[PDB]
Amino acid sequence: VYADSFVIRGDEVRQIAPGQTGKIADYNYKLPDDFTGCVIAWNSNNLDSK
Amino acid sequence: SETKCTLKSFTVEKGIYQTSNFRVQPTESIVRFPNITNLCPFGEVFNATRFASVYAWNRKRISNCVADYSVLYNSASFSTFKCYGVCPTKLNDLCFTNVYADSFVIRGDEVRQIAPGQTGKIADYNYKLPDDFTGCVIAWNSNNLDSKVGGNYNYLYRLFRKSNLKPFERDISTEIYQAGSTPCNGVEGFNCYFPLQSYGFQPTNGVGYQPYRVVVLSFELLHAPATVCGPKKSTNLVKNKCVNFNFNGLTGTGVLTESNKKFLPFQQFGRDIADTTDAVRDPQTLEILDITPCSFGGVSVITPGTNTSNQVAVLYQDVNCTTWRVYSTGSNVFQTRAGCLIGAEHVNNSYECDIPIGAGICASYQTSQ
Amino acid sequence: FNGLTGTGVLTESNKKFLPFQQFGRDIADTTDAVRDPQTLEILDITPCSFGGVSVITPGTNTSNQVAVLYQDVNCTTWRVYSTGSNVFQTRAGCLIGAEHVNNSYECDIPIGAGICASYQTSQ
Amino acid sequence: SLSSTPSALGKLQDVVNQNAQALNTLVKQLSSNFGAISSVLNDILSRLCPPEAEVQIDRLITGRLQSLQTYVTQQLIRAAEIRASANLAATKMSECVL
Amino acid sequence: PPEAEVQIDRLITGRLQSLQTYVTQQLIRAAEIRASANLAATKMSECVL
Amino acid sequence: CVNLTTRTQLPPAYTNSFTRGVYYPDKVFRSSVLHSTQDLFLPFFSNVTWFHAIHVTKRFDNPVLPFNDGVYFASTEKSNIIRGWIFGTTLDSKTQSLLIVNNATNVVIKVCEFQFCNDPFLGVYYHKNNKSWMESEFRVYSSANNCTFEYVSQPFLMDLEGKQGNFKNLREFVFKNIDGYFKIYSKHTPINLVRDLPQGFSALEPLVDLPIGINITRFQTLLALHRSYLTPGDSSSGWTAGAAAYYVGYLQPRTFLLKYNENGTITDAVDCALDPL
Amino acid sequence: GDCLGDIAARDLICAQKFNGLTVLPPLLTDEMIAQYTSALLAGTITSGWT
Amino acid sequence: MYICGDSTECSNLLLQYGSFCTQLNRALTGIAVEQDKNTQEVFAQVKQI
Amino acid sequence: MYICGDSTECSNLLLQYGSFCTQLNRALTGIAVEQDKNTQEVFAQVKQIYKTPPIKDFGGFNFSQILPDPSKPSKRSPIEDLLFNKVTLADAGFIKQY
Numbered sequence A: 001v002y003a004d005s006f007v008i009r010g011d012e013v014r015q016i017a018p019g020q021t022g023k024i025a026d027y028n029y030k031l032p033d034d035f036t037g038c039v040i041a042w043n044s045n046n047l048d049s050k
Numbered sequence B: 001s002e003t004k005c006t007l008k009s010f011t012v013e014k015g016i017y018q019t020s021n022f023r024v025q026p027t028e029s030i031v032r033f034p035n036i037t038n039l040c041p042f043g044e045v046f047n048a049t050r051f052a053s054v055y056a057w058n059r060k061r062i063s064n065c066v067a068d069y070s071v072l073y074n075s076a077s078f079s080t081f082k083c084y085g086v087c088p089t090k091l092n093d094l095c096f097t098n099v100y101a102d103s104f105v106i107r108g109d110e111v112r113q114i115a116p117g118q119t120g121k122i123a124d125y126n127y128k129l130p131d132d133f134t135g136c137v138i139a140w141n142s143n144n145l146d147s148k149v150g151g152n153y154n155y156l157y158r159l160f161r162k163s164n165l166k167p168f169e170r171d172i173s174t175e176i177y178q179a180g181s182t183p184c185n186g187v188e189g190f191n192c193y194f195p196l197q198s199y200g201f202q203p204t205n206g207v208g209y210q211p212y213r214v215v216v217l218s219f220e221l222l223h224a225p226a227t228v229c230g231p232k233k234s235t236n237l238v239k240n241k242c243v244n245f246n247f248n249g250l251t252g253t254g255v256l257t258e259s260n261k262k263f264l265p266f267q268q269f270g271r272d273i274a275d276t277t278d279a280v281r282d283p284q285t286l287e288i289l290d291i292t293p294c295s296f297g298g299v300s301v302i303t304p305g306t307n308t309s310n311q312v313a314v315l316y317q318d319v320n321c322t323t324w325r326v327y328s329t330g331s332n333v334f335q336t337r338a339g340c341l342i343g344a345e346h347v348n349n350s351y352e353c354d355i356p357i358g359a360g361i362c363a364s365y366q367t368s369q
Numbered sequence C: 001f002n003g004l005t006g007t008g009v010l011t012e013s014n015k016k017f018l019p020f021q022q023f024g025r026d027i028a029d030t031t032d033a034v035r036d037p038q039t040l041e042i043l044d045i046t047p048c049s050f051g052g053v054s055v056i057t058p059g060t061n062t063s064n065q066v067a068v069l070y071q072d073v074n075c076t077t078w079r080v081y082s083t084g085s086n087v088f089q090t091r092a093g094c095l096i097g098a099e100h101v102n103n104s105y106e107c108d109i110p111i112g113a114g115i116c117a118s119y120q121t122s123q
Numbered sequence D: 001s002l003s004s005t006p007s008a009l010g011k012l013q014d015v016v017n018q019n020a021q022a023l024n025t026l027v028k029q030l031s032s033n034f035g036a037i038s039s040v041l042n043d044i045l046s047r048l049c050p051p052e053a054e055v056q057i058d059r060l061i062t063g064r065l066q067s068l069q070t071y072v073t074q075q076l077i078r079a080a081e082i083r084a085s086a087n088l089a090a091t092k093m094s095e096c097v098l
Numbered sequence E: 001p002p003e004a005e006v007q008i009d010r011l012i013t014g015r016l017q018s019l020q021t022y023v024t025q026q027l028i029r030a031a032e033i034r035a036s037a038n039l040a041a042t043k044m045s046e047c048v049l
Numbered sequence F: 001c002v003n004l005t006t007r008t009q010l011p012p013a014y015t016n017s018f019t020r021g022v023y024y025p026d027k028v029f030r031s032s033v034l035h036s037t038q039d040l041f042l043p044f045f046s047n048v049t050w051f052h053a054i055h056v057t058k059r060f061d062n063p064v065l066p067f068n069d070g071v072y073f074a075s076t077e078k079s080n081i082i083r084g085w086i087f088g089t090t091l092d093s094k095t096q097s098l099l100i101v102n103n104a105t106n107v108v109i110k111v112c113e114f115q116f117c118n119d120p121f122l123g124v125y126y127h128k129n130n131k132s133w134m135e136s137e138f139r140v141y142s143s144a145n146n147c148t149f150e151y152v153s154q155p156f157l158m159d160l161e162g163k164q165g166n167f168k169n170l171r172e173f174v175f176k177n178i179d180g181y182f183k184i185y186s187k188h189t190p191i192n193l194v195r196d197l198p199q200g201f202s203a204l205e206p207l208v209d210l211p212i213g214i215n216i217t218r219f220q221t222l223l224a225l226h227r228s229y230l231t232p233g234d235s236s237s238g239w240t241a242g243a244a245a246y247y248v249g250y251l252q253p254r255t256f257l258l259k260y261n262e263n264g265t266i267t268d269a270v271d272c273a274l275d276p277l
Numbered sequence G: 001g002d003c004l005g006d007i008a009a010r011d012l013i014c015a016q017k018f019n020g021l022t023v024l025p026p027l028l029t030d031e032m033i034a035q036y037t038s039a040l041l042a043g044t045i046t047s048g049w050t
Numbered sequence H: 001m002y003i004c005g006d007s008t009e010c011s012n013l014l015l016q017y018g019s020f021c022t023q024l025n026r027a028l029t030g031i032a033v034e035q036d037k038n039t040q041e042v043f044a045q046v047k048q049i
Numbered sequence I: 001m002y003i004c005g006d007s008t009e010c011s012n013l014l015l016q017y018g019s020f021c022t023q024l025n026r027a028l029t030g031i032a033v034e035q036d037k038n039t040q041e042v043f044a045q046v047k048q049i050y051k052t053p054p055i056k057d058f059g060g061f062n063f064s065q066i067l068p069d070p071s072k073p074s075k076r077s078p079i080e081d082l083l084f085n086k087v088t089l090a091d092a093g094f095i096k097q098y
């Protein structure tokens, strides 16, 4: 069991999934097509914005 | 060993076993795409000053370009992107034929309707996408472009219609809709309605009421000459060898040779009796090539029991032995009517049959055996 | 009927449905009866198609005349494709498009139930 | 008589036709999609990724195995009929010839 | 269609399987009947004629 | 627009479609093979309506016909009289419709909220001076608002000369309107006929696939008129019907067994629903 | 018309026909078999085994 | 009739399996023919009535 | 080859069905073996290969159409040669090269 963690823009959340393309899926964080696990995300506008 | 694995045993009894087929591997790959040098009009499709009303959407033809989607990475951000044909990770390995980009502006809550199987004002009266669909639907928020403080009323949608639209139809007429029994001869009274309404797009609207720009990219794959290709680099064409290949997105393994087939001008691929591609027209030189599978077959093994010795002879049914498509020459080559037998001595003494091979020939283990 | 679609021939039925039953079914769980939504009449549903068709063919390298046998037609609208003006009723079906002769012969193309056919003479 | 009437040997011609048609059938049956988007494995693989591609490939694998099982069953049935004929022929050789 | 065709295909495959089962059983039975018929034919020649 | 007069009253003729109406159903090459396929095809030996233009009993047929989900159209010509078609629903400026014409210089395809003429036509005037046949009138529509599709071919010069003798050119087309696309298949075959359609077999090849997006329920055929020094100067009666004919059939879902020869040409076909044989 | 009329019977023969299952007649009818059997007996009785 | 029951959508989907239906009937036809042959082998040995 | 056609991804997926492929070939092998057994049961009943004597009279009985014809490349009787030229086989040898 491992927990990967990072911050991205809301429109890019859709890329953290098997089979996706885009800046994150292709160059920053590629999740495999064969994947067991859960992807969880939440808004942090009041924490990570200035 | 192949026989041992097939039989799930570490011991093999005396006799003949079949052992798959003689196969060869490809040594290099060939990639052939038409030499299209222009980049697709991503700017015009996605960076347009104005988009059409959903009731009267645009349909632009795209051809003779390279679909390098990465040009959008430092500019656009999309909230929605979904492909109903190809998995997005493979778009760059393919070529496309009848490629069109439909475009319009709708409210955010209506974005969910641009999909197969949906209902609602857009899906039923403005833009119906077919149940059988190949393409990708892409959309993004345009609140800072398409909204005005007093309301941007330049975007219209159809609210009233008598029946639902069929796929990709447009209806831009402005007849008065009759809801009741009244003839509605330009009346627009209690039971008569003008069919179109504007969206009040304002910068302070909540998200579901903000405008979204929608682009639908329709396409067809692998059955016609390419006009649009992804950004793959081509290679040289290698003939008369077992190779891997990609011809306009169609991949496979085989031996490419010159063909005497003539294709009609609109035919890109040809097929055999089992509907398997067996010929292609090369994308840069319009030469027809035939494709023959690399593998062929006819292999079996003559085995003394393994509890006696590990010497075996191998029969190649489709090899004449007068590179023979054999695993080893073996220095003991006997051609029979049943195949080329390698690894057995040929003697002139006839005997009672022991391990039958075929076509009048048998084998045995005999004497220094 | 209330969202349940299909194709068939609707006829009056002698079935009685319990008050809570809207549809009835056969041994293959296929609806075979409905209660009409406005008039509470029970209707039976019979499939439109039925069957029994075969073609008697002289080789096509000789002629294109054929005769058609209808196994489930008595011919005495007959549920046939054409009357043909040459109608012979046999125990194997209604044979349309063949002449009936009183000369017995050795069997050539067997039809069934003692009847055979052949192509013979202006043939 | 044998020269004049070719049908005399229909019994032997029939076993070389039937066991040839059987293989031509297996090749032709490869064109069926068996519920898949395409009968060609390469189209499935060039357009789809594993989470979906494996479903389409499995539809074809199951269908092709079914075709092969059908073939084998028919050949086993035919083989039994041939054996019976061969046993009769062997009996006649002993009782009519020897 | 995107879903309906899956459900329809499940039924088509199942019905073809039922028909293949039927045909295979009839072929096996037919072989047994033929053997009986050959015996009967033999007896007609050897017991009656 | 002009309302034409001086036409006699005749019943429609009917003919036998025989084995016409097959088109290549794919864009894949295959050869020396029989292939079974299902599509909308003209049924074999179907009832084809025969329309005719002839001066003589003056006849000039340009009726509105139903489209019925797919149309087989064919014509026999000696002198380029059939010029085009109108496809749509009401054809009265309320909805969009498709106009496909050959105006002797360009092939023009437009989709607009056209208001069509009751008797749409094109025409050619014969100048006895210098013996010339020239394109003159073009009626067809009174208005064309809110155009969404437009194409014009490169220029060409069509031969507008009137001709004597038999028909020399057989043109066949198949029109379909599926999922927003107007598909056209076609073939041009040399002929030598006095009347009616020839028997024989030829498959049509795809020509265009137009991204139109409109509803087509009816269509109308556009014929050219001939005018000359020999006719009255009145625009409704001052005309010649020339000599041309066309045939209209309708497509139905059918299964065909198509025969491809060694070079991948369809040479024959079986209509699987024609009869038990 | 016999299967359509007599619904109540729930005749298995009609159920089979409506589902495409067809039973075909034999070429030799019982009357023809009877003639062959009678011929064999006449032969056996008047010209036994010849 | 067995598989689709005259449903049009099924009939079109079933086209891809048409080669299997043809094979099923070739087998049944072969059985049906043998049944008449069996009858003749047993009862039609003497052609003099 | 029948199922995957050398597609690598299919070949790996097909591994789960390997026990079915093995079973199909055991059945086919069993048939193939029986075919040679049938031939021997019918024709190899006598293991003494008796030579036809130089022809001497048989009392007027002429067996030349059943006895092998020595002038032929294959020692078949006139009748056998006729039988061989009437039944037509699918191929004419067992070697077909790539």
Ligand SMILES: *[C@@H]1O[C@H](CO)[C@@H](O[C@@H]2O[C@H](CO)[C@@H](O)[C@H](O)[C@H]2NC(C)=O)[C@H](O)[C@H]1NC(C)=O
Residues within 6 Å of the ligand: B162, B163, B164, B165, B166, F089, F215, F216, F217
């Ligand atoms: C395509 O056009 C036809 C003709 O205008 C439309 O069909 C008519 O629909 C109205 C409203 O239900 C009926 O009162 C008419 O009787 C119909 N006419 C005919 C000839 O069928 C059809 O609905 C249109 N297609 C679409 C998708 O809107």
Ligand SMILES: *[C@@H]1O[C@H](CO)[C@@H](O[C@@H]2O[C@H](CO)[C@@H](O)[C@H](O)[C@H]2NC(C)=O)[C@H](O)[C@H]1NC(C)=O
Residues within 6 Å of the ligand: B320, B322, B335, B336, B337, I093, I095
């Ligand atoms: C293998 O190929 C040869 C040709 O290269 C085939 O033909 C025979 O070749 C030998 C060469 O030593 C000649 O002596 C024979 O006369 C040739 N035979 C004929 C009929 O021309 C040979 O048949 C092939 N082998 C097999 C098993 O097919």
Ligand SMILES: *[C@@H]1O[C@H](CO)[C@@H](O[C@@H]2O[C@H](CO)[C@@H](O)[C@H](O)[C@H]2NC(C)=O)[C@H](O)[C@H]1NC(C)=O
Residues within 6 Å of the ligand: C074, C076, C089, C090, C091
């Ligand atoms: C076809 O229907 C008739 C009744 O309409 C069946 O019955 C015979 O009809 C004929 C009419 O000419 C009479 O002469 C016979 O006497 C009737 N037979 C009996 C037993 O009553 C006829 O059997 C039906 N045909 C078939 C093949 O079933």
Ligand SMILES: *[C@@H]1O[C@H](CO)[C@@H](O[C@@H]2O[C@H](CO)[C@@H](O)[C@H](O)[C@H]2NC(C)=O)[C@H](O)[C@H]1NC(C)=O
Residues within 6 Å of the ligand: F103, F104, F105, F106, F108, F135, F138, F152
């Ligand atoms: C056939 O139609 C075309 C298209 O409408 C006509 O060409 C146009 O003519 C106008 C008037 O001179 C020009 O302003 C346009 O620019 C032309 N369009 C194109 C694409 O060139 C053409 O003149 C017509 N020909 C005949 C004989 O009627």
Ligand SMILES: *[C@@H]1O[C@H](CO)[C@@H](O[C@@H]2O[C@H](CO)[C@@H](O)[C@H](O)[C@H]2NC(C)=O)[C@H](O)[C@H]1NC(C)=O
Residues within 6 Å of the ligand: I055, I061, I062, I063, I064
């Ligand atoms: C068996 O019969 C054949 C005829 O069927 C004899 O062969 C013929 O012999 C004569 C010479 O006496 C030749 O002129 C003929 O051409 C031969 N005919 C054929 C078909 O070859 C044969 O000699 C006889 N053998 C015996 C032992 O009687």
Ligand SMILES: *[C@@H]1O[C@H](CO)[C@@H](O)[C@H](O)[C@H]1NC(C)=O
Residues within 6 Å of the ligand: B042, B043, B046, B047, B071, B072, B074, B075
């Ligand atoms: C859209 O315009 C901006 C400038 O406003 C530019 O930086 C961006 O690259 C353009 N996007 C595309 C796809 O051309």
Ligand SMILES: *[C@@H]1O[C@H](CO)[C@@H](O)[C@H](O)[C@H]1NC(C)=O
Residues within 6 Å of the ligand: B035, B283, B284, B285
């Ligand atoms: C470019 O395409 C043309 C036409 O298909 C072809 O003849 C040519 O060899 C290609 N390559 C280059 C470098 O021009």
Ligand SMILES: *[C@@H]1O[C@H](CO)[C@@H](O)[C@H](O)[C@H]1NC(C)=O
Residues within 6 Å of the ligand: C037, C038, C039
């Ligand atoms: C309305 O429903 C009733 C009860 O089901 C029925 O008897 C009647 O015929 C229906 N139609 C009208 C017009 O009332």
Ligand SMILES: *[C@@H]1O[C@H](CO)[C@@H](O)[C@H](O)[C@H]1NC(C)=O
Residues within 6 Å of the ligand: F001, F002, F003, F118
């Ligand atoms: C032609 O006649 C119709 C009535 O049948 C009329 O509505 C139309 O306006 C007339 N057109 C012209 C050009 O006179």
Ligand SMILES: *[C@@H]1O[C@H](CO)[C@@H](O)[C@H](O)[C@H]1NC(C)=O
Residues within 6 Å of the ligand: F014, F047, F048
């Ligand atoms: C249809 O064709 C037949 C000939 O097969 C002809 O007798 C009949 O009059 C035609 N009717 C129509 C409406 O075309």
Ligand SMILES: *[C@@H]1O[C@H](CO)[C@@H](O)[C@H](O)[C@H]1NC(C)=O
Residues within 6 Å of the ligand: F127, F129, F130, F132
């Ligand atoms: C022929 O003469 C007429 C005048 O009568 C003129 O209008 C026409 O353009 C001339 N044709 C040619 C080809 O010059």
Ligand SMILES: *[C@@H]1O[C@H](CO)[C@@H](O)[C@H](O)[C@H]1NC(C)=O
Residues within 6 Å of the ligand: B056, B172, F145, F146
């Ligand atoms: C249709 O034409 C009218 C003018 O008659 C115009 O006001 C309206 O905006 C046009 N509609 C479209 C979709 O172009």
Ligand SMILES: *[C@@H]1O[C@H](CO)[C@@H](O)[C@H](O)[C@H]1NC(C)=O
Residues within 6 Å of the ligand: F261, F262, F263
């Ligand atoms: C096929 O093409 C070749 C080469 O042009 C030609 O000789 C042959 O006659 C053609 N065959 C047919 C059936 O058209």
